[model samples]
Target: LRVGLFPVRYLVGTGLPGAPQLVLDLMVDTVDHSVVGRAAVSQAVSPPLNFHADVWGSYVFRLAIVQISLQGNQGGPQSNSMITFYGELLLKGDGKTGVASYRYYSNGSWHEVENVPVKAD
Candidate 1:
């Protein structure tokens, strides 16, 4: 499916049970804005703060192992925020299904939690 010039918004999450909250608001311009790549209006936990993602993938079922660095009160990625998560996005099943997994950077290495849910927002 082509995302022709339309502004696509995705409500990101970990695909848990119950309801999926509008955690992150990611937008991409199919056409070509002055901006180089995709744009984002993301939110984490509560008290939603403002945020942005410099580069984004146009893949329909998977993200290209991107490094997301949130900032400025959004509580993410080494910013003045409260949380920071890094990892990959997997979307399969005709784009109707998706999942996210985060990695922890410690002791000069990246590690994944053992059987924990991956939260993306």
Candidate 2:
């Protein structure tokens, strides 16, 4: 899907028995404010910190290969070229559906975890 300011994410493992305590806040880049390719892991993948996630909130990974997304059209092979990415989301936002996607919940309702503009973490 084409996401401009939308959020997305990735995940892996056994979900909770009920609701989760926290969620990932995704940021992404766009062309002229329009959604670009899939959001990639931002800040964490850059310098200074050079961390793949740039920055992230405190949390543990119950599952491996967690979802990821981003929103920084800095411009590069990924952004410049018309490429589809199967990577991580890299950006921050307010904890809301419209602002950012809700985090994955194995035991949570698929309705909330379903297709969303918010990126995964």
Q: TM-score of each candidate?
A: 0.33, 0.19
Query: Residue by residue across 26-118, what tens digits does model 1's lDDT show?
Result: 444445321123223333435543334333333332254322222122333334443223434454444333555443333345434222222
lDDT score for candidate 2 against the true structure: 0.29
Q: Which candidate is the best by lDDT?
A: 1
How would you encode candidate 2's per-residue C-alpha lDDT over 51-77 as one tens digit per residue? 121222222122332233332323433
Per-residue lDDT value at 50 in model 1? 35
Q: State the local distance difference test value for candidate 1.
A: 0.36
Worst-scoring 10-residue span by lDDT in model 1: 66-75
Q: Which 10-residue window in model 2 sums to the lowest lDDT?
A: 48-57
